[PDB]
Amino acid sequence: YYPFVRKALFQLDPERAHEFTFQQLRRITGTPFEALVRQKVPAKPVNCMGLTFKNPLGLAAGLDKDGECIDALGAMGFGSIEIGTVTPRPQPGNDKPRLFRLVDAEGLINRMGFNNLGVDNLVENVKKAHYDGVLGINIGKNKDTPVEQGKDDYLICMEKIYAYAGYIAINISSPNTPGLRTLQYGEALDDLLTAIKNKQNDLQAMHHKYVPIAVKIAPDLSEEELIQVADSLVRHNIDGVIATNTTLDRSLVQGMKNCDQTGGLSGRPLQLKSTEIIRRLSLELNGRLPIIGVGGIDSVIAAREKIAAGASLVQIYSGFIFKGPPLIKEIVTHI
Amino acid sequence: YYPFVRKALFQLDPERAHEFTFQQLRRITGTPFEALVRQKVPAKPVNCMGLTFKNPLGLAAGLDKDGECIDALGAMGFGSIEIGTVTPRPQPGNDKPRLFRLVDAEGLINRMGFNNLGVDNLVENVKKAHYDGVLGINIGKNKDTPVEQGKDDYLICMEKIYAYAGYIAINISSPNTPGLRTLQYGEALDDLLTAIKNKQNDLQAMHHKYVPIAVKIAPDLSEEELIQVADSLVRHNIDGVIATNTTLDRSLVQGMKNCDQTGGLSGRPLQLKSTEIIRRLSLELNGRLPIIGVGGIDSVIAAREKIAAGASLVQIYSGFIFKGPPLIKEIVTHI
Ligand SMILES: Cc1cc2nc3c(=O)[nH]c(=O)nc-3n(C[C@H](O)[C@H](O)[C@H](O)COP(=O)(O)O)c2cc1C
Ligand SMILES: Cc1cc2nc3c(=O)[nH]c(=O)nc-3n(C[C@H](O)[C@H](O)[C@H](O)COP(=O)(O)O)c2cc1C
Ligand SMILES: O=C(O)c1cc(=O)[nH]c(=O)[nH]1
Ligand SMILES: O=C(O)c1cc(=O)[nH]c(=O)[nH]1
């Protein structure tokens, strides 16, 4: 019963609680206790980006950064699993403490900064996985790589993951790598999208398959910036858009412990803004490429609000932490 | 632990559940026996409509339509309690069943039609109460009164309750009395507000007491309709507006048990719409009179979203049913 579990894990700091949880998931994979995490959910098959998703709910990136627990997380009923963000070379990310709970807000603040073991290790992990649903692989820039040359890092990762990903997610929305978010503005975006599409075309000829690419944007775009991002994704024929990542906003969590910690805010205090961004983006895209909606989804009605705003699929991170596997069941069953 | 209480209570049909709980509250309200439900909450004083509310959270109209349980409900920690709706003469409401639960959506559908015992009886209950918060008295039109002469039903009630109310709430937004929502449109509205306001100054010199009046609107108004209502409230110098009552919409609840029942929807599937109405209303009023926000509030963050859209105070009903007394403590403590 999850609230009991939650009380226990919440005695630990958020990063220690994840390390504890993932150590158990890594220990039960392929044992009669991959059943202690198994959850039967109804099938709600959905076509998106040319893929067939088991159901419309995915696990957002950032929980399994290295793809070590694909099978056990898939057993919980997700229609798809997004691993990463991963970078070309390993790096440690920002100093701990870099992750904080806002329990009364059912929100989180993270400044992880892409702590990961690099793309080559993720591929080895993916090779060993058995999951049948859709696998997202989310990639990003190494901290040291200069922002103007960001595209090189995305292109390196694509080459190593094309044979293994169901779809590739491009992360240019983390607030935790300096200047990374400038890649979603103007000619930087157009240059990045051009490089990436051309690689997709080259890699299609080498592997004889088309692997869709979705771009993951920030909820802190202005109305004009969002119109420009939408136009740029259409003109470059990007396969999808993941809306949204975490927010610099703090206006709903004033006066709450940790609200002043720098980083991206997620969970319930992001829900409304996420939904407003999806609805404005859907008007701009007008059906031309699909939206994956993420941001503070913590209930069936919240998932349904994002569908109404224009998304074809939804993802959760924070609501999984605060409501647990029951939320997967709720959403898949009634979305 | 309310989620276990709720499991049991949700074994009874909704109205039986209500009557069983209120039968219990009736036998303890205004006695030492109310230690059983008393909750200690911090003081968060807010000045609104010329009154001091001991905290920003009200019980919306509904739960106690006859004013039977003011002290008991006050002891759970509400900063204000709104009783009613009440009409001049008693009336039984519509035929049962008239109250339906949508558990997975955490919303309710109701077509009660103002089942109450009449204003004379409510005044006698109010006389016996000792609540130290603000008491609101919501008043409505008898089912038989022609909407043309609706104003007479409101003026009757005002005379009988003025000496006892903290503020008076004019319900012209229930969808359960035919024609009533027309009283918020164009010329009907201007006439009612003229009559109600004239009566208010009348009663102020008779009783030497300042009693603000607020109008409760529907969430299903068009932009042009909302602009007109707001303009009309300002021109007649109404003291505040309560946004919003229940909705005729069903977009978010398709495919759920009871989604096709006629009546007003409340709880989580009204939350987004209610907030958007408040935001748009606030834009119009430009601070010229305060908003009491209500509609699907079920968490401290949702309460704060309504504050950020412009509300000065908030009320709960459906969230009270679905999360219980602890929602009171969350909201008063962290709003
Ligand atoms: C601790 C943490 C780490 C995250 N890491 C990543 C990441 O590496 N890549 C990415 O694209 N998003 C990452 N995210 C963002 C989530 O994928 C998600 O988009 C965001 O938290 C909003 O969704 P939510 O409100 O359901 O949590 C991370 C989020 C958190 C809370
Ligand atoms: C069963 C029920 C009875 C209600 N009775 C009244 C009423 O008598 N007068 C009134 O103004 N609103 C009444 N309401 C509406 C609530 O006061 C509230 O405005 C609406 O339910 C939205 O808030 P909520 O989603 O938190 O419940 C009633 C609502 C329900 C569910
Ligand atoms: O790893 C991170 O810091 C990170 C990445 C991302 O996309 N979003 C976020 O909030 N944090
Ligand atoms: O009691 C009712 O019928 C009623 C009144 C009101 O204002 N709103 C509502 O949804 N129901």
PDB file of N, CA and C and ligand atoms in Angstrom, chain A residues 65 85 110-115 171 173-176 245-246 264, ligand 3:
ATOM      1  N   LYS A  65      18.007   7.295 -15.842  1.00  0.00           N
ATOM      2  CA  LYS A  65      18.928   8.038 -16.707  1.00  0.00           C
ATOM      3  C   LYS A  65      19.822   7.111 -17.523  1.00  0.00           C
ATOM      4  N   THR A  85      18.027  11.511 -19.461  1.00  0.00           N
ATOM      5  CA  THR A  85      18.922  11.984 -20.525  1.00  0.00           C
ATOM      6  C   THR A  85      20.305  11.394 -20.413  1.00  0.00           C
ATOM      7  N   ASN A 110      14.827  19.910  -9.006  1.00  0.00           N
ATOM      8  CA  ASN A 110      16.075  19.231  -9.302  1.00  0.00           C
ATOM      9  C   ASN A 110      17.009  20.155 -10.076  1.00  0.00           C
ATOM     10  N   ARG A 111      18.288  20.039  -9.787  1.00  0.00           N
ATOM     11  CA  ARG A 111      19.333  20.557 -10.653  1.00  0.00           C
ATOM     12  C   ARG A 111      20.351  19.447 -10.924  1.00  0.00           C
ATOM     13  N   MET A 112      19.870  18.320 -11.453  1.00  0.00           N
ATOM     14  CA  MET A 112      20.762  17.186 -11.680  1.00  0.00           C
ATOM     15  C   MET A 112      21.906  17.559 -12.614  1.00  0.00           C
ATOM     16  N   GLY A 113      21.593  18.182 -13.750  1.00  0.00           N
ATOM     17  CA  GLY A 113      22.626  18.479 -14.725  1.00  0.00           C
ATOM     18  C   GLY A 113      23.120  17.284 -15.512  1.00  0.00           C
ATOM     19  N   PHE A 114      22.243  16.324 -15.810  1.00  0.00           N
ATOM     20  CA  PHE A 114      22.602  15.206 -16.682  1.00  0.00           C
ATOM     21  C   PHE A 114      23.702  14.339 -16.067  1.00  0.00           C
ATOM     22  N   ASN A 115      23.527  13.959 -14.809  1.00  0.00           N
ATOM     23  CA  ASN A 115      24.381  12.924 -14.230  1.00  0.00           C
ATOM     24  C   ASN A 115      24.093  11.597 -14.924  1.00  0.00           C
ATOM     25  N   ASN A 171      16.812  16.699 -25.948  1.00  0.00           N
ATOM     26  CA  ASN A 171      16.592  17.547 -24.779  1.00  0.00           C
ATOM     27  C   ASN A 171      17.362  18.853 -24.949  1.00  0.00           C
ATOM     28  N   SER A 173      15.853  21.554 -23.202  1.00  0.00           N
ATOM     29  CA  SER A 173      14.980  22.258 -22.273  1.00  0.00           C
ATOM     30  C   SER A 173      15.418  22.170 -20.805  1.00  0.00           C
ATOM     31  N   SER A 174      16.441  21.389 -20.473  1.00  0.00           N
ATOM     32  CA  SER A 174      16.959  21.373 -19.106  1.00  0.00           C
ATOM     33  C   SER A 174      17.419  22.768 -18.680  1.00  0.00           C
ATOM     34  N   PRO A 175      16.980  23.263 -17.523  1.00  0.00           N
ATOM     35  CA  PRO A 175      17.553  24.496 -16.979  1.00  0.00           C
ATOM     36  C   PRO A 175      18.889  24.296 -16.289  1.00  0.00           C
ATOM     37  N   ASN A 176      19.471  23.099 -16.340  1.00  0.00           N
ATOM     38  CA  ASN A 176      20.586  22.759 -15.471  1.00  0.00           C
ATOM     39  C   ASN A 176      21.908  22.571 -16.199  1.00  0.00           C
ATOM     40  N   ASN A 245       9.339  20.231 -20.093  1.00  0.00           N
ATOM     41  CA  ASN A 245      10.320  19.990 -19.044  1.00  0.00           C
ATOM     42  C   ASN A 245       9.937  20.808 -17.799  1.00  0.00           C
ATOM     43  N   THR A 246      10.868  20.941 -16.849  1.00  0.00           N
ATOM     44  CA  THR A 246      10.642  21.667 -15.596  1.00  0.00           C
ATOM     45  C   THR A 246      10.698  23.186 -15.802  1.00  0.00           C
ATOM     46  N   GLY A 264      14.946  23.230 -11.742  1.00  0.00           N
ATOM     47  CA  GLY A 264      13.637  23.095 -12.377  1.00  0.00           C
ATOM     48  C   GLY A 264      12.584  22.549 -11.432  1.00  0.00           C
TER      49      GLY A 264
HETATM   50  O1  LIG C   3      19.278  16.284 -15.479  1.00  0.00           O
HETATM   51  C1  LIG C   3      18.791  17.357 -15.223  1.00  0.00           C
HETATM   52  O2  LIG C   3      19.222  18.199 -14.513  1.00  0.00           O
HETATM   53  C2  LIG C   3      17.561  17.707 -15.857  1.00  0.00           C
HETATM   54  C3  LIG C   3      17.311  17.483 -17.169  1.00  0.00           C
HETATM   55  C4  LIG C   3      16.072  17.927 -17.715  1.00  0.00           C
HETATM   56  O3  LIG C   3      15.718  17.786 -18.875  1.00  0.00           O
HETATM   57  N1  LIG C   3      15.242  18.559 -16.832  1.00  0.00           N
HETATM   58  C5  LIG C   3      15.482  18.804 -15.512  1.00  0.00           C
HETATM   59  O4  LIG C   3      14.676  19.379 -14.799  1.00  0.00           O
HETATM   60  N2  LIG C   3      16.693  18.358 -15.063  1.00  0.00           N
END
